[PDB]
Design a protein around this ligand. Structure first.
Ligand code: MG
Lengths: 60, 48, 71, 48, 35, 48, 157, 51, 337, 145, 49, 103, 48
């Protein structure tokens, strides 16, 4: 759901949704969250690809 | 007129078949609009 | 593509019985058991004064229909 | 979700008149008790 | 009409000339009853 | 009721047919169709 | 090849003589088939009325064995069943595929392709997953607009 | 009384997909139409003769 | 053998009068699919149709007596008994219904066909009926208890026709697997398989006097003696098309009605076609709707009734003024193969 | 009733259950009878070609000729043989005869106040719209003619 | 009830309880009515279970 | 109010109509991002059907066009059925042919 | 123009849906023509 929230035209929403992927990965581990993020890189839209690239470095 | 007695009965059949006629207050609200629109149109001719 | 019905006999050779299982249907109950054997200024003022066909849709009955129920 | 009609108005109406709709009425041999409560249901009424 | 022309009866029939309760085979009573 | 309809009387019934006859001739049938089937003619007289 | 198919069975019999008489069966020969076929059908009705497990439907209805060498004797007795027990304890609904019957096979004894060629159906409404006015104006129309244009010019002048 | 309305749902579904996923679907469908469906090889794939 | 064929111009088949049309009756809303004459008095005939009804018609005047509602799909065959005041009707909705005529109501229903039923035949001496259709079996019913007492298994395709006779073979049947089977019903098995027809056999009719059956395939009409599986005659039915119905008269006239609207008359002993007519359809109907779907002769044998694909009933008549000399047949030239 | 229930417990429910023609499976059953009757009349006109491959193609022209009657469009296949064309036309007119008279029969029930289902009231208005437009197009064609 | 009489048929003298006492499996005795009815409560509860 | 068809959208229509046919316009709209089902139907019938006639008029077409436009004054869909040309082409050609009569 | 039919149970009646951008021009022209006919007294007193 946070993945669908990245299409928002607000910069707070995108910025705090990316923080939340960090907290979720610290609990349940990287690799379930990495796969959904890597598959989100295939969209056309630039906002979505730039926000999943931020989130991957947070998970790392 | 007999022609407009049948028009009113076909209106009540239409109310009991429309989308939203399962919601109880929607059905009641449509009963009130068609009953008001009948009685305020004819008014005296209903009596006899 | 149905392409073939079911032949009846592949049911009829099945070894439940000659009969069905033993279901008693309500329409197979007894009835009708006995067979029956046979032995002027106002008139001048105006300007214009003085088959059965074999098709359903092109008929006279059909166009009186569409004149009544499509108003 | 676009065409189907919302359940929430029927439930709203039914809850309001529920002590009259779910009244003790006449004895039918037994009564059904709703689990984890002591609410008795005096008919089979799904919206209630 | 003229498809058949001269010696042919063409008749269109939309009405039952009988009633919907006529035996259409008369019951045979071997005896005469007076009761 | 039958007491208070038009009384079907030859002097009156023919007058109703003649008035309609005069009016149907005045419009050419390529514009509209004026038919006796769709017409009502009420006559007021000594007998009506 | 030989024992099954012949040449007389190809050819008709009235082909030579048209006045060949095939008669009716007879009054006596129909009454003998009538008696024994009616006797077979009521045997099958009574066996089928008596196995429906109705006491109600049943109002509408021997040693028989010797030995293989006739050595001992055999008396056959039917046992009387408990009416509450499931009658025909072997009976249960089952599917049985049946083999081919034992009797041998009967002999069968019996340009245009460009005329009978069917085109391929291609629909405007539906697409399969794979392999993706002459008549002129009537003269009444001509003559209406000439009249309406004369009346228009004559009125405006 | 609900059955009068005539609208159903299949159980176990997830809903409507997102518009970035319809945009990926449509963009692939347009290319295979205009291509007439031909398979393009990749340059690295160490090579059926194409049009 | 050709010496025998040299003799074959010495028989010279018997002359029959040509037939012509007298009455055209309209009134069904679909194709007229089946017809049966009152087998006692000739006071009426009955027709079932594609519009799911049956209608009763006065024979002399042509007038409509009564309409019988009672099926939801096409009524494909009807039968009226000699011995009972009973009417048996069959439909495409898998039902067999008995009609007491004296009340004009349904009295008995017959259950058990997997699909649509096309033929019904009444047994001449027993109180038994025979039905068959797409399920490729014949069922023999008990008329009284409504029980499927016997089931005949053999045909490999849907069955088109069933006839009944007083002696063995009790039941004759013809199906879409191009065979005619003769049945021993007590043993429940086929007495004889006639394999000579090349395609689906649509029509049969029994001779009223000679104890024989005729059967028709497309372009192929053959007659059979019922005592043995023996071919009696081949008919000059070449180029005649699909045959839908067959009718045999007391005076040895075989009628063959076809899907091209062409009436075809035959002499039964020889197989010689002496007349070919053509139906005119109606006003507003299609060229495909010129076809003949059912036929029956009346009990005297001088009127032929046909119901057709243009929803009409045509009554055919034989000419009395037409003596032999100015009405010969159609050139008896018996060709070779 | 108890006899039927107890017989099913020890012997099972038969696999030879034939389901009747009821109002919910009537349109399906009309389909199968018209589809079998069209393949019979065409396969008897063919000399000795084939039975399996052409057959699916023939029933696709039939379904297409019925979508053309409903759309009021003429159905012309350019290289189709003339006797296959007259069988499909005869059977499309027979289906259309049933379709029209059932629409009149159900419209008169809806008028006289007889209880009709909601799905069947709705299917009736769809038929009477297409019938109304066909009278309207035939009215326009004649004024040109 | 007076307007629509339903007449008995003369053939039906078979009578369930007489055809059941022909077999081995049923016997007779005489008991109290309250005993007979308390048995049928026990017996019918076994059949449904 | 735009309704601008770029030439790649014309190629997507013709390929899309070759697949889905002529009655499934909502499939044909599923391939276009910016066009509706009625918008796609309208360009096929008036522009992109290859059975349409957009050529130059011959001299006997213009005498047929001035004749019809006087008998049926403004009925441009009835005239275009008789010319067997698109309606908008007949209207423009009519206006130019009246401006060939000009000072 | 699209056409659909209205269910009235005794008859059906057609409804025409015109294109929206064309409806703005037609709705202006409707208001404008009735305003001018009323100023200029086109229709006499008997027309209802
Ligand atoms: Mg569902």
């Amino acid at each position: 759901e946070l993945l669908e929230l990245l299409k928002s035209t607000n910069k707070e929403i995108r910025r705090s949704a990316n923080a939340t992927f960090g907290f979720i990965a610290e609990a349940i581990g990287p690799h379930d969250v990495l796969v959904a993020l890597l598959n989100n890189l295939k969209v056309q839209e630039r906002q979505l690809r730039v926000c999943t690239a931020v989130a991957i470095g947070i998970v790392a | 007129s007999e022609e407009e007695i049948k028009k009113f009965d076909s209106r009540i059949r239409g109310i009991l078949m429309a989308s939203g006629s399962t919601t109880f207050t929607k059905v009641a609200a449509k009963w009130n609009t068609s009953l008001i629109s009948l009685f305020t149109y004819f008014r005296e001719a209903i009596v006899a | 593509t149905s392409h073939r019905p079911q032949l009846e006999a592949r049911s009829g050779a099945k070894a439940a019985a000659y009969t069905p299982t033993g279901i008693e249907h309500a329409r197979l109950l007894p009835g009708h058991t006995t067979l029956k054997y046979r032995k002027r200024s106002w008139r001048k003022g105006t300007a214009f004064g003085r088959g059965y066909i074999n098709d359903m849709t092109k008929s006279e009955y059909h166009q009186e229909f569409l004149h009544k129920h499509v108003r | 979700q676009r065409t189907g009609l919302s359940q929430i108005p029927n439930r709203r109406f039914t809850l309001w008149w529920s002590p009259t709709i779910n009244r003790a009425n006449v004895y039918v041999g037994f009564l059904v008790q709703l689990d984890l409560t002591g609410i008795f249901l005096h008919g089979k009424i799904p919206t209630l | 009409e003229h498809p058949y022309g001269k010696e042919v009866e063409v008749l269109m029939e939309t009405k039952n000339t009988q009633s919907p309760q006529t035996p259409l085979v008369e019951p045979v009573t071997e005896r005469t009853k007076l009761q | 009721p039958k007491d208070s309809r038009m009384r079907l009387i030859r002097q009156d019934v023919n007058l109703g047919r003649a008035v309609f006859w005069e009016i149907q001739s005045r419009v050419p049938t390529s514009l509209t169709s004026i038919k006796w089937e769709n017409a009502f003619v009420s006559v007021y007289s000594k007998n009506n | 090849i030989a024992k099954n198919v012949k040449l007389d069975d190809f050819i008709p019999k009235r082909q030579s003589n048209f006045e060949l008489s095939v008669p009716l069966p007879t009054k006596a020969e129909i009454q003998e088939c009538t008696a024994r076929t009616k006797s077979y059908i009521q045997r099958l009705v009574n066996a089928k009325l008596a196995n429906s497990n109705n006491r109600a439907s049943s109002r509408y209805v021997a040693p028989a064995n010797l030995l293989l060498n006739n050595s001992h004797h055999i008396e056959v007795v039917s046992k009387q069943m408990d009416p509450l027990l499931p009658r025909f304890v072997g009976k249960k609904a089952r599917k049985v595929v049946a083999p081919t019957e034992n009797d041998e096979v009967v002999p069968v004894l019996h340009a245009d392709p460009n005329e009978w060629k069917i085109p391929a159906a291609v629909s405007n409404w539906k697409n399969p997953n794979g392999y993706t006015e002459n008549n002129t104006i009537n003269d009444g129309f001509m003559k209406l607009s000439e009249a309406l244009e004369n009346a228009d010019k004559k009125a405006r002048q | 009384m609900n059955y009068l309305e005539g609208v159903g749902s299949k159980k176990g579904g997830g809903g409507i997909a997102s518009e970035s996923q319809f945009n990926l679907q449509r963009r692939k469908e347009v290319e295979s139409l205009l291509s007439k469906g031909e398979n393009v090889p990749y340059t690295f794939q160490d090579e059926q003769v194409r049009s | 053998i050709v010496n025998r064929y040299e003799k074959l111009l010495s028989q010279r088949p018997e002359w029959h009068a040509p037939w012509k049309l007298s009455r055209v009756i309209n009134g069904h809303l679909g194709w007229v699919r089946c017809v049966a004459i009152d087998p006692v008095d000739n006071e009426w005939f009955i027709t079932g149709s594609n519009d799911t009804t049956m209608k009763v018609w006065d024979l002399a005047t042509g007038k409509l007596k009564t309409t019988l509602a009672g099926h939801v799909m096409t009524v494909r065959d009807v039968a009226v008994s000699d011995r009972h005041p009973y009417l048996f009707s069959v439909s495409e909705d898998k039902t067999v219904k008995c009609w007491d005529l004296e009340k004009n109501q349904i009295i008995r229903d017959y259950y058990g066909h997997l699909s649509g039923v096309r033929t019904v035949s009444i047994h001449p001496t027993l109180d038994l009926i025979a039905t068959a259709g797409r399920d490729s079996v014949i069922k023999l019913w008990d008329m009284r208890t409504r029980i499927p007492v016997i089931t005949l298994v053999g045909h490999k395709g849907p069955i088109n026709q069933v006839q009944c006779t007083p002696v063995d073979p009790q039941v004759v049947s013809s199906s879409t697997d191009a065979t005619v089977r003769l049945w021993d019903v007590v043993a429940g098995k086929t007495m004889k398989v006639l394999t000579h027809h090349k395609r689906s056999v649509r029509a049969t009719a029994l001779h009223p006097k000679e104890f024989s059956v005729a059967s028709a395939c497309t372009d192929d009409i053959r007659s059979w003696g019922l005592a043995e599986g023996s071919l009696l005659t081949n008919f000059e039915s070449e180029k005649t098309g699909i045959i839908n119905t067959l009718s045999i008269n007391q005076d040895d006239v075989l009628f063959a009605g076809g899907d091209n609207g062409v009436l075809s008359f035959y002499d039964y002993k020889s197989g010689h076609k002496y007349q070919s007519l053509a139906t005119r359809e109606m006003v507003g109907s299609l060229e495909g709707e010129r076809s003949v779907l059912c036929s029956t002769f009346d009990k005297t044998g001088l009127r032929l009734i046909t119901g057709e694909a243009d929803k009409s009933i045509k009554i055919w008549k034989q000419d009395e003024t037409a003596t032999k000399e100015s009405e010969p047949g159609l050139a008896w030239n018996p060709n070779l193969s | 009733y108890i006899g039927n229930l107890i017989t099913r417990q020890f012997e099972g429910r038969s696999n030879e259950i034939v389901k009747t023609t009821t109002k919910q499976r009537l349109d399906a059953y009309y389909d199968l009878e018209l589809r079998n009757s069209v393949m019979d009349d065409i396969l008897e006109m063919m000399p000795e070609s084939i039975r399996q491959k052409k057959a699916r193609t023939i029933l696709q022209h039939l379904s297409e000729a019925w979508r053309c009657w409903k759309a009021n469009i003429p159905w012309d296949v350019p290289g189709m043989p003339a006797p296959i064309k007259k069988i499909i036309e005869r059977y499309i007119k027979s289906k259309a005869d049933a379709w029209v008279s059932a629409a009149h029969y159900n419209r008169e029930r809806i008028k006289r106040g007889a209880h009709v289902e909601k799905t069947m009231v709705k299917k009736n208005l769809g038929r009477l719209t297409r019938l109304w437009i066909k009278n309207e197009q035939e009215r326009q064609r004649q004024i040109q003619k | 009830n007076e307007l629509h009489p339903t007449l008995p048929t003369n053939h039906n003298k078979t009578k369930l309880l007489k055809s059941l006492k022909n077999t081995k499996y049923f016997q007779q005795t005489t008991i109290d009515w309250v005993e007979a009815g308390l048995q049928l409560c026990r017996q019918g509860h076994n059949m449904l279970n | 109010k735009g309704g601008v068809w770029t030439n790649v959208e014309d190629q997507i229509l013709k390929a899309a109509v070759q697949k889905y046919g002529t009655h499934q316009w909502s499939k044909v709209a599923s391939l276009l991002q910016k066009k509706t089902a009625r918008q796609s139907e309208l360009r096929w019938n008036e522009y992109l059907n290859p059975k349409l006639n957009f050529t130059e008029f011959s001299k006997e077409e213009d005498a047929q066009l001035l004749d019809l436009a006087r008998e049926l004054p403004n009925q441009w869909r009835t005239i275009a059925d008789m010319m067997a040309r698109p309606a908008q082409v007949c209207v423009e050609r009519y206006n130019r042919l009246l401006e060939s009569e000009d000072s | 123009v699209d056409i659909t039919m209205m269910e009235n149970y005794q008859n059906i009646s057609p409804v025409y849906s015109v294109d929206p951008l064309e409806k703005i021009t037609d709705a202006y022209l409707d208001q404008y023509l009735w305003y001018e006919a009323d100023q200029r007294k086109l229709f006499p007193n008997w027309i209802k």
